[PDB]
Amino acid sequence: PMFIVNTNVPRASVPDGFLSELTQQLAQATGKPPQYIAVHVVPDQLMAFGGSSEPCALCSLHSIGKIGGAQNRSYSKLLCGLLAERLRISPDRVYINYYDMNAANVGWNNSTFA
Amino acid sequence: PMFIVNTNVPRASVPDGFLSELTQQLAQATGKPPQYIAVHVVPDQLMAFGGSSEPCALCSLHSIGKIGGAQNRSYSKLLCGLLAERLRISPDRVYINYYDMNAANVGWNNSTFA
Amino acid sequence: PMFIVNTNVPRASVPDGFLSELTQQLAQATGKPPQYIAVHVVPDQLMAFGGSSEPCALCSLHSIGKIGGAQNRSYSKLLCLLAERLRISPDRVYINYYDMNAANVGWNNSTFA
Ligand SMILES: O=C(O)c1cccc(-c2cn[nH]c2)c1
Ligand SMILES: O=C(O)c1cccc(-c2cn[nH]c2)c1
Question: Which residues carry this modification: N6-succinyllysine (chains A, B)?
Answer without folding.
Answer: 77
